[PDB]
Amino acid sequence: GLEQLEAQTNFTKRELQVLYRGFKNECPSGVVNEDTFKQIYAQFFPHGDASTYAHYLFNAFDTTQTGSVKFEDFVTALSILLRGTVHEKLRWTFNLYDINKDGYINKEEMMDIVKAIYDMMGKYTYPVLKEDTPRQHVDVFFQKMDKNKDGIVTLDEFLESCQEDDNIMRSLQLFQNVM
Amino acid sequence: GLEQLEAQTNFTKRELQVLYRGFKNECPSGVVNEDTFKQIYAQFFPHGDASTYAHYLFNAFDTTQTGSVKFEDFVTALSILLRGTVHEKLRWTFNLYDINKDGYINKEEMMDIVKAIYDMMGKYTYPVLKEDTPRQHVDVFFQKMDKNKDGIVTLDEFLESCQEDDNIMRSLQLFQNVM
Amino acid sequence: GLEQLEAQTNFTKRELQVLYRGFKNECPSGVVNEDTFKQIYAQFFPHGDASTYAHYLFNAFDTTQTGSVKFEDFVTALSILLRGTVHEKLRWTFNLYDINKDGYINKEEMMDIVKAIYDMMGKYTYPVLKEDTPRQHVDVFFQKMDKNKDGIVTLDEFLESCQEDDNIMRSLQLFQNVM
Amino acid sequence: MTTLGYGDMVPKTIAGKIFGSICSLSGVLVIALPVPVIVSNFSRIYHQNQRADKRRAQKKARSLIESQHHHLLHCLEKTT
Amino acid sequence: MTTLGYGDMVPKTIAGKIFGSICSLSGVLVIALPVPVIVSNFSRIYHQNQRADKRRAQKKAR
Amino acid sequence: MAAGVAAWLPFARAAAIGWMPVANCPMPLAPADKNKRQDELIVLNVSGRRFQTWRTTLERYPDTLLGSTEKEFFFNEDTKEYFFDRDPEVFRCVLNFYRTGKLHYPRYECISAYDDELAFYGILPEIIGDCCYEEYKDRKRENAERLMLSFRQTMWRAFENPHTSTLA
Amino acid sequence: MAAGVAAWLPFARAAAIGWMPVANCPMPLAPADKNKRQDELIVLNVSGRRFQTWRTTLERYPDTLLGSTEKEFFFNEDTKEYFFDRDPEVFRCVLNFYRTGKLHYPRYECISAYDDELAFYGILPEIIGDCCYEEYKDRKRENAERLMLSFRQTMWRAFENPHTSTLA
């Protein structure tokens, strides 16, 4: 119900109408399934593959374990990712990174996400392309994200290094004014 | 033009609209010809023949000598016959009676009109039917209408007896209020 | 006419419009015949037979002896049964019970009505089913309804016992407020 | 007239040949009058029965109100 | 029944002739039942494939 | 003067004056005058779509709904508009019946929808103008067509349909 | 009294009074009375074209868009009008489904347009009234039809279409 949902998400009333219209106009609210993400996202990333990354935040958005969740649980995560709190956005992204759904990210596990982004980059890397460099870009992660220096990261062990990197706390807040 | 016609006939504006609509609705203003009178009149006189009388006031209405005159020259005579002056109504009826169009009614001539009305009466006369009696009903006319006592009548010789018969000067004024 | 009918029944104007619409919407005012009662009523009583009882108040509603009466004589009895006076409701129900239309209910006669209700009850009686018990449920009637103790009942002999049974004078007044 | 032509009897004049040649065409014409309508109505009835069987098969495929409605049902268990 | 009429065997009674004359018309009737639908469906499938090829070509325009 | 059904009656009232001179009878009959009032645009409001018409158009056929006095169950005097909760693409043909006098049939209406509108408004399908009459009958027939014991009789039931059981 | 879906329930409430005398049971069940309010004309405003209907017409089918409570994402309370940015020639048939109960098919709609309107509003094409059902299927089938490795397999690819290359 429009009002039961307004009092949960950060949007207003008008901005809930203005995107229920847009949502329903392309998928007449059966519910989005992967075959709709893999093309709604892909229309934003030509010259690249968008499927294999979309196949992680599709599992992220979907709080329940269905194959297609809803509209309410769609805007409930849009509101968080855009105008939510940094301590909540970070938890959401963390739940995206935790591929085994358990609460632990392994170096090769998040490597499965970086090999997806770098895949989305394009057919030819603009500078020289190196396949071992997605192997440093993951480990350079732990260099901050591991206050245990063991090679395994949990939610507190992920955040307690991600709250002082000023640049992201200014790029975790890019769109929270644009509309 | 609605205004060039309002200032000629006695009707108002609304009563000219309200019958242009009715006129045009049945004959979409080609113009009425006899084949339209002989059935528009006849729908008012069942159990009787209306054609042979309609074939005299069709020639009366028609000031020009066409085979179908107009709408303007239709209401121009409606206004006279209903709300015109008695001295004008009488002239109009007189022009109807003057079958030879010349200015003279002969006893058998107006007999041609009375044999038309009595035909319109019906198949069987309600009291006894007599064919010599349309022969008195015409002559009883002249008994007033002939201040010459010759058997021939003209417009002055027709009116100078028809202005004191109070009953018709109250039945030449039947409808001039109903609408 | 809406106004000739408003001043007879207890309904208002709006509540006469709001049910002429409903009536006409399903039977476009030919008039209801049994084949319409036996299914309009039956849609309210699944798991049961509604025809054989409907075939008594169809004869009740119908003041005249046609095979389908009207709408005016439909709401004229609706208004009585819902918002009429108790002394009038009782007369109406009495005219329903008097199957021989004469003014006398016999024990087996009203048994013909109770064997209809109990038929409407369902296929299997919720407690034990007994076919002699519709035989007491009728006679327990007379135990009050017969101040003659003869076994035959008329309108006064039916009412003079039915005005003190407080429970029905509170259940002869169930719906006279709901709308 | 039926375009069999067994050949047991054939004309041998110069007039008989003309009338036989006319006869054959006349038969082709006369007999070709029913065979339109007969085959048309055969197809017609067969397709009619076809849609009939498929229609029957498609047939073989096949709260503030419940409170007020069930209130009556309660009010009927006044009988016991 | 097929309106060949080789002529090798022909009736020579006055009843055999009647039944042969009936037989020929009966054959014309019986055999003329499929040849409507068969030719209709031949035309049907051929025009279907024709619009198919032209549709694919119009797609190859794009 | 008068409109609608009595629209040509002024013409006959005028023609009548042809009799008054030769009318030797003593008196005529005084006219039939009574209360008078002008025409007005009745505003039919069929499912949001507003139709309009002179009242004297509506009262040309008085054994119907719109013509009789039982279209007053649909009056909404908070607005002075007749509101029918019906279809607004078949009220057009019904209305053009009242205007001209011949009822029509649009080539493309689901004949069931047309028939029950005609039922609701009082019109009878008998009166359809002949210009478009038999195609109504074609749609009628096609639609109609589209709509169309222990042991001693169980043998009968099984025979005439071998596909009932396996023994048959 | 009540309208729309519970429109004949006054009739059964009246018939019930036939029982009260013979009802020897002690008490009845007190009725189901609750808050009350009259009907009102909901103003659907489909792409400029305004449709209107009694609210109790709309709530006869509550697993749909217009019937349920999720047509409130289309309310424009600056005007109190539901504005749908959809097609206004297929909302007519959808609406007449809610009025009568049988969904129709106009002979001349591009079947794709009809299907996705039905999709958007919540209606299912299963429920089309039989009066106009199989012509929907004819349009359906015709439309559907209108819509319808180095070396060791390159030989296969070339064979079954000689017009691939010149060697084939």
From Swiss-Prot, chains A, B, C:
UniProt-listed GO biological process terms: chemical synaptic transmission; membrane repolarization; muscle contraction; potassium ion export across plasma membrane; regulation of heart contraction; regulation of potassium ion transmembrane transport; regulation of signal transduction
Q: Name one GO molecular function term.
A: calcium ion binding
Q: In which tissues is it expressed?
A: Isoform 1 and isoform 2 are expressed in brain and kidney. Isoform 1 is also expressed in liver, pancreas, skeletal muscle, small intestine and testis. Isoform 2 is also expressed in lung, pancreas, leukocytes, prostate and thymus.
Q: State if Cytoplasm is listed as a keyword.
A: yes
Q: Where in the cell is it found?
A: Cell membrane; Cytoplasm; Cell projection, Dendrite
Start and end residues of each EF-hand domain = 1-46, 49-84, 85-120, 133-168
Q: List the disulfide bonds.
A: none
Q: Which superkingdom heads the taxonomic lineage of this protein's source? A: Eukaryota
What keywords does the record list, in alphabetical order?
Calcium, Cell membrane, Cell projection, Cytoplasm, Ion channel, Ion transport, Membrane, Metal-binding, Potassium, Potassium channel, Potassium transport, Repeat, Transport, Voltage-gated channel
Coiled-coil annotated residue ranges, if any: none
Q: Does the keyword Nucleotide-binding apply?
A: no
Q: How the protein sits in the membrane? A: Peripheral membrane protein
One Gene Ontology cellular component annotation held by this UniProt entry: synapse
Give the binding site residues for Ca(2+) 1: 98, 100, 102, 104, 109
In this chain, the stretch annotated as Interaction with KCND2 covers 166-179
Query: Record-annotated residues binding Ca(2+) 2?
Result: 146, 148, 150, 157
What function is annotated for this protein?
A: Regulatory subunit of Kv4/D (Shal)-type voltage-gated rapidly inactivating A-type potassium channels. Regulates channel density, inactivation kinetics and rate of recovery from inactivation in a calcium-dependent and isoform-specific manner. In vitro, modulates KCND1/Kv4.1 and KCND2/Kv4.2 currents. Increases the presence of KCND2 at the cell surface.
Q: Which family does it belong to?
A: Belongs to the recoverin family.
Q: How does it assemble?
A: Component of heteromultimeric potassium channels. Identified in potassium channel complexes containing KCND1, KCND2, KCND3, KCNIP1, KCNIP2, KCNIP3, KCNIP4, DPP6 and DPP10. Part of a heterooctamer composed of the tetrameric channel and four KCNIP1 chains. Probably part of a complex consisting of KCNIP1, KCNIP2 isoform 3 and KCND2. Self-associates to form homodimers and homotetramers. Interacts with KCNIP2 isoform 3 in a calcium-dependent manner. Interacts with Naja atra venom CTX3.
User: What name does this protein carry?
Assistant: A-type potassium channel modulatory protein KCNIP1
Species per Swiss-Prot/TrEMBL record: Homo sapiens
Q: Which residues of the full protein are shown?
A: 49 to 227 of 227
From Swiss-Prot, chain E:
Any notes on this protein's domains?
Answer: Two N-terminal domains regulate binding to and modulation by KCNIP1.
* Protein's UniProt name: A-type voltage-gated potassium channel KCND3
Residues passing through the membrane, by range: 14-36
Organism, by scientific name, is Homo sapiens
What positions does the entry give for K(+) binding?
3-6
Sequence motif Selectivity filter, residues: 3-8
Family that this chain belongs to = Belongs to the potassium channel family. D (Shal) (TC 1.A.1.2) subfamily. Kv4.3/KCND3 sub-subfamily.
Q: In which tissues is it expressed?
A: Highly expressed in heart and brain, in particular in cortex, cerebellum, amygdala and caudate nucleus. Detected at lower levels in liver, skeletal muscle, kidney and pancreas.
Q: What is the effect of changing residue 28 to I?
A: In BRGDA9; uncertain significance; gain of function mutation
Q: What does this protein do?
A: Pore-forming (alpha) subunit of voltage-gated A-type potassium channels that mediates transmembrane potassium transport in excitable membranes, in brain and heart. In cardiomyocytes, may generate the transient outward potassium current I(To). In neurons, may conduct the transient subthreshold somatodendritic A-type potassium current (ISA). Kinetics properties are characterized by fast activation at subthreshold membrane potentials, rapid inactivation, and quick recovery from inactivation. Channel properties are modulated by interactions with regulatory subunits.
Question: In the record, where are the intramembrane regions found?
Answer: 3-10
> Where is this chain's protein located in or outside the cell?
Cell membrane; Cell membrane, Sarcolemma; Cell projection, Dendrite
Q: How does it assemble?
A: Homotetramer. Heterotetramer with KCND2. Associates with the regulatory subunits KCNIP3 and KCNIP4. Interacts with KCNE1, KCNE2, SCN1B and KCNAB1 and DLG1. Component of heteromultimeric potassium channels. Identified in potassium channel complexes containing KCND1, KCND2, KCND3, KCNIP1, KCNIP2, KCNIP3, KCNIP4, DPP6 and DPP10.
| Illness | Spinocerebellar ataxia 19: A form of spinocerebellar ataxia, a clinically and genetically heterogeneous group of cerebellar disorders. Patients show progressive incoordination of gait and often poor coordination of hands, speech and eye movements, due to degeneration of the cerebellum with variable involvement of the brainstem and spinal cord. SCA19 is a relatively mild, cerebellar ataxic syndrome with cognitive impairment, pyramidal tract involvement, tremor and peripheral neuropathy, and mild atrophy of the cerebellar hemispheres and vermis.
Reading the lineage from the top rank, the first entry is: Eukaryota
